[PDB]
Design an enzyme around this catalytic site. Sequence first.
Site, PDB file in Angstrom:
ATOM      1  N   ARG A 233       0.733  -1.190  -0.171  1.00  0.00           N
ATOM      2  CA  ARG A 233       0.021   0.055   0.153  1.00  0.00           C
ATOM      3  C   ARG A 233       1.016   1.368  -0.018  1.00  0.00           C
ATOM      4  NH1 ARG A 233      -2.065   3.407   3.736  1.00  0.00           N
ATOM      5  NH2 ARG A 233      -4.439   4.240   3.495  1.00  0.00           N
TER       6      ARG A 233
ATOM      7  N   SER B  72     -12.688  -3.834   1.369  1.00  0.00           N
ATOM      8  CA  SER B  72     -12.989  -2.997   2.459  1.00  0.00           C
ATOM      9  C   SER B  72     -14.532  -2.771   2.621  1.00  0.00           C
ATOM     10  CB  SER B  72     -12.313  -1.673   2.528  1.00  0.00           C
ATOM     11  OG  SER B  72     -11.081  -1.673   2.456  1.00  0.00           O
TER      12      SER B  72
ATOM     13  N   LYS C 106      -4.312   6.011   8.279  1.00  0.00           N
ATOM     14  CA  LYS C 106      -5.075   6.562   7.218  1.00  0.00           C
ATOM     15  C   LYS C 106      -5.869   7.690   7.567  1.00  0.00           C
ATOM     16  CE  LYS C 106      -9.002   4.477   4.635  1.00  0.00           C
ATOM     17  NZ  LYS C 106      -8.526   5.368   3.321  1.00  0.00           N
TER      18      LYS C 106
HETATM   19  C1  LIG Z   1      -5.372   0.883   5.330  1.00  0.00           C
HETATM   20  C2  LIG Z   1      -6.313   0.884   6.466  1.00  0.00           C
HETATM   21  C3  LIG Z   1      -6.228   1.500   7.751  1.00  0.00           C
HETATM   22  C4  LIG Z   1      -5.055   1.716   8.567  1.00  0.00           C
HETATM   23  C5  LIG Z   1      -4.360   0.729   9.512  1.00  0.00           C
HETATM   24  O1  LIG Z   1      -3.354   1.446  10.214  1.00  0.00           O
HETATM   25  P1  LIG Z   1      -2.929   1.099  11.586  1.00  0.00           P
HETATM   26  O2  LIG Z   1      -1.552   1.761  11.924  1.00  0.00           O
HETATM   27  O3  LIG Z   1      -2.847  -0.396  11.688  1.00  0.00           O
HETATM   28  O4  LIG Z   1      -4.024   1.663  12.325  1.00  0.00           O
HETATM   29  S1  LIG Z   1      -7.921   1.437   8.352  1.00  0.00           S
HETATM   30  C6  LIG Z   1      -8.817   0.967   6.861  1.00  0.00           C
HETATM   31  N1  LIG Z   1      -7.820   0.689   6.080  1.00  0.00           N
HETATM   32  C7  LIG Z   1      -8.102   0.194   4.612  1.00  0.00           C
HETATM   33  C8  LIG Z   1      -7.881  -1.417   4.391  1.00  0.00           C
HETATM   34  C9  LIG Z   1      -8.746  -1.923   5.143  1.00  0.00           C
HETATM   35  N2  LIG Z   1      -8.575  -3.317   5.352  1.00  0.00           N
HETATM   36  C10 LIG Z   1      -7.627  -4.018   4.607  1.00  0.00           C
HETATM   37  C11 LIG Z   1      -7.331  -5.328   4.713  1.00  0.00           C
HETATM   38  F1  LIG Z   1      -8.640  -6.159   4.563  1.00  0.00           F
HETATM   39  F2  LIG Z   1      -6.687  -5.891   3.629  1.00  0.00           F
HETATM   40  F3  LIG Z   1      -6.930  -5.695   5.764  1.00  0.00           F
HETATM   41  N3  LIG Z   1      -6.797  -3.328   3.650  1.00  0.00           N
HETATM   42  C12 LIG Z   1      -6.838  -1.999   3.806  1.00  0.00           C
HETATM   43  N4  LIG Z   1      -6.112  -1.323   2.897  1.00  0.00           N
END
Ligand SMILES: Cc1c(CCOP(=O)([O-])[O-])sc[n+]1Cc1cnc(C(F)(F)F)nc1N
Length: 226
Positions: free
Chosen positions: A50, A121, A150
């Site tokens: 990503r 998602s 995000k």
């Molecule tokens: C990229 C992202 C977030 C950020 C998480 O960052 P953190 O630092 O762990 O809070 S919250 C929602 N998203 C979209 C998203 C959701 N779920 C998945 C999956 F299904 F492939 F997992 N991939 C994604 N790219």
Amino acid sequence: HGIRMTRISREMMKELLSVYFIMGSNNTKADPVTVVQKALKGGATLYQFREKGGDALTGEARIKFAEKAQAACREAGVPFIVNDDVELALNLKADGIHIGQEDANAKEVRAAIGDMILGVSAHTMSEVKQAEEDGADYVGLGPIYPTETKKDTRAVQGVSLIEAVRRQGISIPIVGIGGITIDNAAPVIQAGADGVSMISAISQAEDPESAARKFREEIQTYKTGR
Ligand SMILES: Cc1c(CCOP(=O)([O-])[O-])sc[n+]1Cc1cnc(C(F)(F)F)nc1N
Ligand SMILES: [Mg+2]
């Protein structure tokens, strides 16, 4: 994991979602590929490339970074998933693609990727049902907990949607995401998820390998306990 000639089984997909690491070059202050290698060595079961937003790599530099991350996944025997970019997923022969509600339509994407892994998602019951109908192999539900990785995220929902989905008899593979750490991951699995996904908990850890290993051990324990 080679070229698929059939849709992935739900049993295998659920195993892959266990510890789903997601990362781009702008999510860590260390060397990007090195962090991915450490996460895989530690035990991540799936990885999503990503690379977007400000400061992210673009053009040829972005493609070259993707190739190196894919090579790291190959060495670890872990599938490589691309976020958003269908063309890049096809060009690199990635194992799958992940899209959101504001991206290309799932029906359109499923038709373009054949039997590749497709994640979508979702934030509501209707979106979860639409994703399954469109041919998604798994859904990413969240944000479970507060997160700033995000910027444009929807309202925090805890494990409410995960429980509601399972209560309606939907058995599609689910991975929870959003502010997940080793300290709050258990509840996500107990609610019915097949795994947890994270960026910063691993990408910004002083010891990414150990963090991934802890996640792997923890998730296995709770999947057996529920
Ligand atoms: C990229 C992202 C977030 C950020 C998480 O960052 P953190 O630092 O762990 O809070 S919250 C929602 N998203 C979209 C998203 C959701 N779920 C998945 C999956 F299904 F492939 F997992 N991939 C994604 N790219
Ligand atoms: Mg997207």
